[PDB]
């Protein structure tokens, strides 16, 4: 299902509890429209891909996660698996989430 990260502590725990399924992270700003404007897609895949783990991060209130990931543009899609990174891509591209997930699925 989906899982919100409020601090770096929940970040690592998210990957550990994410099991071995894919893990896509949405680095969108809650106060920014253009970023949150794409949540109806990323979060929607939650019901279309119940076999995938989706996370959420606040690049403004969780600068700790964005700092470690050095995010400089939102939304930033980052893919993790077993606590390891396998791919990543930013830019409003909700349709790409489909091809990317089916790729490293």
């Amino acid at each position: 299902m989906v899982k919100q990260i409020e601090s770096k502590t929940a970040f690592q725990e998210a990957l550990d509890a994410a099991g071995d399924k894919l893990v896509v992270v949405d680095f969108s700003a809650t106060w920014c429209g253009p970023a949150k404007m794409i949540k109806p897609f990323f979060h929607s895949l939650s019901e279309k891909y119940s076999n995938v783990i989706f996370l959420e991060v606040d690049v403004d209130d969780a600068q700790d996660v964005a700092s470690e990931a050095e995010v400089k543009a939102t939304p930033t899609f980052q893919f993790f698996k077993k606590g390891q990174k396998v791919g990543e891509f930013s830019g409003a591209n909700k349709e790409k989430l489909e091809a990317t997930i089916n790729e490293l699925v």
Binding site: S28, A29, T30, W31, C32, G33, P34, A35, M37, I38, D58, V59, D60, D61, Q63, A66, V71, K72, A73, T74, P75, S90, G91, A92
Partner: peptide, 13 residues
Amino acid sequence: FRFRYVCEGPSHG
């Protein structure tokens, strides 16, 4: 305040 860098969502085009 909660501000950081630019949001290149559907803002580019």
